[PDB]
């Protein structure tokens, strides 16, 4: 009974936050964005088709120069790409062909690769050796590496299927700080631009904030009704948006801690697998389990643009930091970029 | 259109040629999925064909075999089951003498794993092979503990036929598919002969589907 008396005091604490959640929220963002002129139509044509893989393409990440990108496919090969000239620059064999994530370092020196093999692999691109060699293997997880992201050249934060997120360091290869609190396996994580706070999404119908330095949970965001497949952060750093299997894309603020709106359409029953923003907002790219991608207005939740290039389910998506193009990969073994 | 651009085109052609050769070399290998449960004789099957997933490779005659053992994953199956869509065959290992054990008997919950994996939307047409284990101990010890509804013979062969019949008809998704059961003696010399004759029986019919005949 001693655990049971701790339950209802935690439930009223959950009632203590949620009425304070409702005390802050009286008017939504949708009534605020009535006066703003709608974006209209966004016609985007495939400038370059970065194909050359042989199996299902699962993850991509843009480089900081917005020319090179890294693409991970389930054949067992990792390819660094070039945007304008459409010529691959590096082809990286993988020790484990099972890969579900990839990361490009902000410095451009390193590339992180993972998968369900419980190993994180980091590869040095511009070696004095001249070849591409793995710096070292990273083995401290017991699930499946859902997503790994480069916080820094020396600090890398990954999200794994053992219901935990862990901060690593290359020079020692051990967990400096580990993040626990997600009941189910996490699926994606998107760090803020200042690389101090980051968020993770799981199969909990909820997402939780994290502070990198001391490794404690800051915020607990819920409102979903199924597993979050992909998450993305607002480049302002003051908001973020999520995608799930519920075919609803929801927008959240960090300190205002509320669901601003849900991006749902009746014809869209297929869930979301990739979310990315624009630099100024006013846009939300979203990839669905249906074979076309989709573009949403970030402020009015309208059917702004439609991207129907691929014939298979889109798995990965991303945008350049200068905004020049958006990238999109799918299980059809093709990469194509619009503008 | 300079020397640097020409040499970039050169290196792109080089990497494309290497990638095409690597893909043609990789395409010959046969992919097999093992879904052996706890104490299902995974050690027995890996000893008879000879922290994450364990990958093993063996050669039979002129054909390569590439099997990936999914063991101790401890995660939600739906997130990573679609990674094995291109795998030709799914191998199932089930112990038979563990019908006297309850965690909710292992036998009954084993059918729920098979019922779920058969009725999924990714595995509409993937040939299913299931094996057995501990059948001699099951014959020695045996009925009323796990299957009182049979209400029949305690004899081993009729009981083994009863258990094998229940797994063959978990659901009607096996109608479009093809189940390949085999009485695994756990001492039989090459039970990969069951697999090799089954995996070629997929390959003729996979060719026949692609041949535009049947």
């Amino acid at each position, epitope marked *: 009974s001693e655990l049971d008396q701790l339950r209802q005091e935690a439930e009223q604490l959950k009632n203590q936050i949620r009425d304070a959640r409702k005390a802050c929220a009286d008017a939504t963002l949708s009534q605020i964005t009535n006066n703003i002129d709608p974006v209209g139509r966004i016609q985007m044509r495939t400038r370059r088709t970065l194909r050359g893989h042989l199996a299902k393409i699962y993850a991509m990440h843009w480089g900081t120069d917005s*020319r*090179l990108l890294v693409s991970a496919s389930q054949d067992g090969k990792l390819i660094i790409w*070039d945007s304008y*000239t459409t010529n691959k*620059v*590096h082809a990286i064999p993988l020790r484990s062909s099972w890969v579900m994530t990839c990361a490009y370092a902000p410095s*451009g020196n390193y590339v992180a690769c993972g998968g369900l093999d419980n190993i994180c692999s980091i590869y040095n691109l*511009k070696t*004095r*050796e*001249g*070849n591409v060699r793995v710096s070292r293997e990273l083995a401290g997880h017991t699930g499946y590496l859902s997503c790994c992201r480069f916080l820094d050249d020396n600090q890398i934060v990954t999200s794994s299927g053992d219901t935990t997120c862990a901060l690593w360091d290359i020079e020692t290869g051990q967990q400096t700080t580990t993040f626990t609190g997600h009941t189910g396996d996490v699926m994606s994580l998107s760090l803020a631009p200042d690389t101090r706070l980051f968020v993770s999404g799981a199969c909990d119908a909820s997402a939780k904030l994290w502070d990198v330095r001391e490794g404690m949970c800051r915020q607990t965001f819920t409102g979903h009704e199924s597993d979050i497949n992909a998450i993305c952060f607002f480049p302002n750093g003051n908001a973020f948006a999520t995608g799930s299997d519920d075919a609803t894309c929801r927008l959240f603020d960090l300190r205002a801690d509320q669901e601003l709106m849900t991006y749902s359409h009746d014809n869209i029953i297929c869930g979301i697998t990739s979310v990315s923003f624009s630099k100024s907002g006013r846009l939300l790219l979203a990839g669905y389990d249906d074979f076309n991608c989709n573009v949403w207005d970030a402020l009015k939740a309208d059917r702004a643009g439609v991207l129907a290039g691929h014939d298979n389910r889109v798995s990965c998506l991303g945008v350049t930091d200068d905004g020049m193009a958006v990238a999109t990969g799918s299980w059809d073994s093709f990469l194509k970029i619009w503008n | *259109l*300079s*020397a*640097e*651009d*020409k*040499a*970039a085109v*050169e*290196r792109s*052609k*080089m990497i494309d*040629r290497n990638l095409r050769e690597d893909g043609e070399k990789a395409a010959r290998e046969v992919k097999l999925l093992l879904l052996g449960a706890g104490e299902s004789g995974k050690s027995t099957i890996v000893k008879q064909m000879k922290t994450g997933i364990v990958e093993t490779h063996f050669t039979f005659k002129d054909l390569h075999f590439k099997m990936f053992d999914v063991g101790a994953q401890r995660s939600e199956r739906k997130k990573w089951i679609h990674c094995f869509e291109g795998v030709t065959a799914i191998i199932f290992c089930v112990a038979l003498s563990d019908y006297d054990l309850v965690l909710m008997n292992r036998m009954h919950e084993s059918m729920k794993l098979f019922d779920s994996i058969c009725n999924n939307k990714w595995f509409t047409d993937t040939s299913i092979i299931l094996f057995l284990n501990k059948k001699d101990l099951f014959e020695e010890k045996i009925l009323t503990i796990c299957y009182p509804e049979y209400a029949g013979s305690n004899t081993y062969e009729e009981a083994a036929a009863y258990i094998q019949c229940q797994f063959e008809d978990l659901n009607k998704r096996k109608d479009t598919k093809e189940i390949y059961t085999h009485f695994t003696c756990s001492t039989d010399t090459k039970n990969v002969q069951f697999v090799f004759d089954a995996v070629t029986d997929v390959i003729i019919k996979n060719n026949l589907k692609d041949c535009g005949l049947f």
Partner: single-chain antibody
Amino acid sequence: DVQLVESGGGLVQPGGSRKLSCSASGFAFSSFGMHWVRQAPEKGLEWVAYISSGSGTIYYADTVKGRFTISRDDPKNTLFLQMTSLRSEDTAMYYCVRSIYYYGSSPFDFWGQGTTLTVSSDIVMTQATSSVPVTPGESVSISCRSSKSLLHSNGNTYLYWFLQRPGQSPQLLIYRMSNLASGVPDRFSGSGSGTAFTLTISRLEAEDVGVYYCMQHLEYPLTFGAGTKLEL
């Protein structure tokens, strides 16, 4: 780390033939492109030959074409060059050069030791004065002009600066007119216009003494400069 050692550089009868080989070790030479660069025994650095990464594209010079050939063999990891019909112009200190070619790659990054080989249009690029007297601690600037502008349509100019250390192999300082090479201090920095090109040496000390060079990279001829011997 890596080793580029050359073999068989000696006396050859005029008009004869000599096999020249560059033994490579410690890098992915199957992926690396290879060059050959002539150094005259007194003065004058210039290009000899180019071989592809996959041995598909081969280029030569005006006095090099036909009577020179260059080959390679990846499994034993060495570079080859069969050389015919030698004379006084062929008398040279031939250097072994590696060069990798992709986006952000630094070609001509490492050089071999050389061959002591003695016997018995094109883009003009001139360095202004071959001798600049300096003091160890003040900043100097040198430059070389180009016949034509090196600014290609993709917005990237192609020019490389080199330092001939006195008596041994050179090195690459800055590649494509703006990006310094690895292992080089940040004091060296090149700049200039689309046709005017210059180097800015800042706070030089007692190891920068030597002959400096600049190269064109718009075409596979890869024409050199005259050379500025930077004496103290």
